[PDB]
Amino acid sequence: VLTQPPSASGTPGQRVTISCSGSSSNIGSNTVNWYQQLPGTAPKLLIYSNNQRPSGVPDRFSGSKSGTSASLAISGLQSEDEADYYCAAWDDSLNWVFGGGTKLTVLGEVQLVESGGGVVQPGGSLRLSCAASGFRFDDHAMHWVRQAPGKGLEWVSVISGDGGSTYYADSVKGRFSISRDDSKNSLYLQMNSLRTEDTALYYCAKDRSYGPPDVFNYEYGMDVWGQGTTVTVSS
Amino acid sequence: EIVLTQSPATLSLSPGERATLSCRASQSVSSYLAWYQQKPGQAPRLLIYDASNRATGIPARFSGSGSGTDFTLTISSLEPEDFAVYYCQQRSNWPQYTFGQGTKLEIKGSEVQLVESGGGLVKPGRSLRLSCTASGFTFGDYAMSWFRQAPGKGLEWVGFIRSKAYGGTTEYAASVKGRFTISRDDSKSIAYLQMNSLKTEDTAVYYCTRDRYARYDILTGLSPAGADYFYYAMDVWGQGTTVTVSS
Amino acid sequence: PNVTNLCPFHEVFNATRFASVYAWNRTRISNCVADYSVLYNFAPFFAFKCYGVSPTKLNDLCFTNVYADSFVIKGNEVSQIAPGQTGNIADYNYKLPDDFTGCVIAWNSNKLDSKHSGNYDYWYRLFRKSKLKPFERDISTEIYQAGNKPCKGKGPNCYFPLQSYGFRPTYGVGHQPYRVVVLSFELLHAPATVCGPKK
């Protein structure tokens, strides 16, 4: 589990650091990622490899990792920086862990479309689909991330570029099944025996890395995010 | 350099009689001998490989014998539809195949598929490119060879493209060196034969054939006479294309 | 004391020519100060997996000598370099012990080790009768007999033991060339000549 401060504040022009504490099996052993989620939008990859920055990210964001801890520096706060920032890493227990999120408050083309959500009774079934366009589908790994209404991000499953290695979260182990079809550029997720805790907003994320995060533990990162689908488990 | 001569030119035998075919080897093609059956209008079908092993799918009446400078094909059954031409192929020089003249045998007296496109009437000094689309097997782990048969004459090898594992180089026969070019495209599983500066002697039906399996880790645990060895290692012939060149 | 005798990691990581996986080059690193922080300055690494040790604590441990093994493989075969793994590379090209103490570094080299017409200069042994022992190199190029008859040169049942990768830039990730460096830390009874920086 990654520990983040619950909140953070800063006036425009200042710099604010967001801390992230982890264990020796997730941070230090592997690399750390940072994600920004504006209210009502999908998360955005800000930092990978603990210090690297994608092309469409301003120079105001810088990453640092010292031992088993990491931090995110945002120099020159703007009104557009008010969002939720998450700390992500790969744990040696074969699961992706998020930091819970830190809410920052200031004082003063590749596309992924998802479908298959709906309302089901507790214990039913549902299959989500994700169509990919604009990139080589077999060269990038795919992730599934769900987010409860008004809560943090939670990783569900991942499948490698060749579809050989698949990992699932402990909460959905034995109930969810992930699969990909390179011939039609589709990502599937079979959900069986749903609980009330499975009510969330499921995201379809593209990884910049090909192999699973346990092999390429130094470059993984959810680069492209799609518009999620709402599932509801209600009686 | 090695010359293969078949003793009987035309053999006339009624159904139910025994047939014996001979093949002389200039020099020793020890156990590097194959026998093919070609019915008129079809591709040659492999009967005996290694001069003793029968192909998986032919009756037990086809008995291959001989080792060294003399080889014998024996057909000793009812012989109901064995009316075809039988050729003697040697593979001592692995890339360079040489066939016999052929023996006429008159009657009175799966998803692994190769499809070939192109080939038509062409002026002498022009050019023509043939294609060989593969299916049913992994294209890239195999080599590809090209053969041609002039109308009324025997078989001869044209070229040979190696797999990606062994450099992918090309070798050609002395009659087609500098004129023909063989390409390979593993992404779409197709083989090409770029023919340039044609002549009237190039009028023939061109075939493409699967060659040595590059994945020898599978061939180690397989018996040479087994059905798996023939399915993985041996040849696959496709329907040829007629290339007519004249004024 | 002033930091002197920096271990030459640039000659291994920033080398122009990398060896094949069947003839992986072993470089002995001894009697020098090893700053394991300069590794991240060479190239953006794709994989950094340390076995038996912690990557952040590498600057605190003293060792007698360090061996650096460098070779080239494809993307799908980078999973085979690990203690207790199977595959053609992990069994017949380069095998690590089960008690391996070190770190494996891999990064994509599609921009250097790949040619437009195919780079057939990198070879790998596909199969051998007996699996390799830990830290064993087989350079013999005798013709492998796949059939039941003795071989007399390249033929139908004969096989050259080394096969080429044929790296092309249009190949997807997994078949693209990857340069892998493996570090082995040895703790003998001799004085530990390879130590970390002291501040």
Cβ atoms of C79 and C73 closer than 8 Å = no
Calpha distance A98→A114 (Å, rounded): 22
Provide the token pair at C97: 């012990």
Instruction: State the method.
Output: cryo-EM
> Which residue on chain B is closest to C127 by alpha carbon?
B217
**Class of residue A24 by CB neighbours under 10 A (exposed 0-12, middle 13-18, buried 19+):** middle
Of C48, C78, C174, the CB nearest to A161: C174
Token pair, residue C149, equals 């008859």
Are B168 and C166 inside 8 Å of each other by CB?
yes
CATH of the domain at A76: 2.60.40.10
What's the resolution in A? 2.7
Q: Do A216 and C46 touch (CB under 8 A)?
A: yes
List of residues 6+ apart from C81 with CB closer than 8 A: C73, C89, C90, C94, C96, C104, C106, C180, C182
What whole-number distance in Å separates Cα of residue A56 and Cα of residue A58? 7
Measured CA to CA, the distance from residue B83 to residue A199 in angstroms comes to 74
- Domain range for A76 is 2-103
For an interface test with A, the pick among C173, C175, C181 (most A C-beta atoms closer than 10 Å) comes out as C173
User: Hey, what amino acid is at B54?
Assistant: R
| Helix or strand holding residue C89 (H, E) | helix C88-92
Could you tell me the CA-to-CA distances from B26 to B93, B96, B98, C145 in Å, in that order?
Answer: 13, 15, 12, 26
Over the range B177-200, which residues count as b (16 or more CB within 10 Å of their CB) and which as e? Answer: eeebbbebebeebbbbbebeebee
Amino acid (one-letter) located at A60: R
For residue C144, list chain B residues with Cβ-Cβ distance below 8 A.
216
| C-beta of residue C83 within 8 angstroms of C-beta of residue C121 | no
Where do the domains of chain C lie, and which CATH numbers do they carry? 10-186 (3.30.70.1840)
Half-sphere exposure of B172 (CA within 13 A, CB side): 13
- Cβ neighbors of A79 (< 8 A, separation 6 or more) are A12, A106
- Is the CATH number 2.60.40.10 carried by domain B113-237? yes
Q: Where are the beta strands (DSSP E) in C43-176?
A: 47-51, 65-74, 102-108, 123-125, 144-145, 158-159, 162-164
Which of A28, A68, A162 lies closest to C76 in CB terms? A162
> Å from A140 to nearest chain C CA?
8
What is the tally of helices (H) and strands (E) in chain A? 0, 21
The contacts of residue A159 (CB under 8 Å, 6+ apart) are A141, A142, A165, A166, A178, A179, A180, A187
Tell me the helices (H) and strands (E) count for chain C, helix number first: 2, 9
Residues of chain B with CATH 2.60.40.10: 4-106, 113-237
Cβ <8 Å between C156 and B166 = no
Do A and B share at least 3 CB pairs under 8 Å? no
CATH code for residues B4-106: 2.60.40.10
Burial zone of A93 (CB within 10 Å; 0-12 exposed, 13-18 middle, 19+ buried): exposed
Both tokens of residue A231? 């599932």
Residue of A24, A49, A215 with shortest CB distance to C78: A215
CB-neighbour burial class of residue C4 (10 A; exposed 0-12, middle 13-18, buried 19+): exposed
Selecting from A67, A136, A161 the residue whose C-beta is nearest the C-beta of C56 gives: A67
Q: Give the Cα separation of B189 and B41 in Å (integer).
A: 26
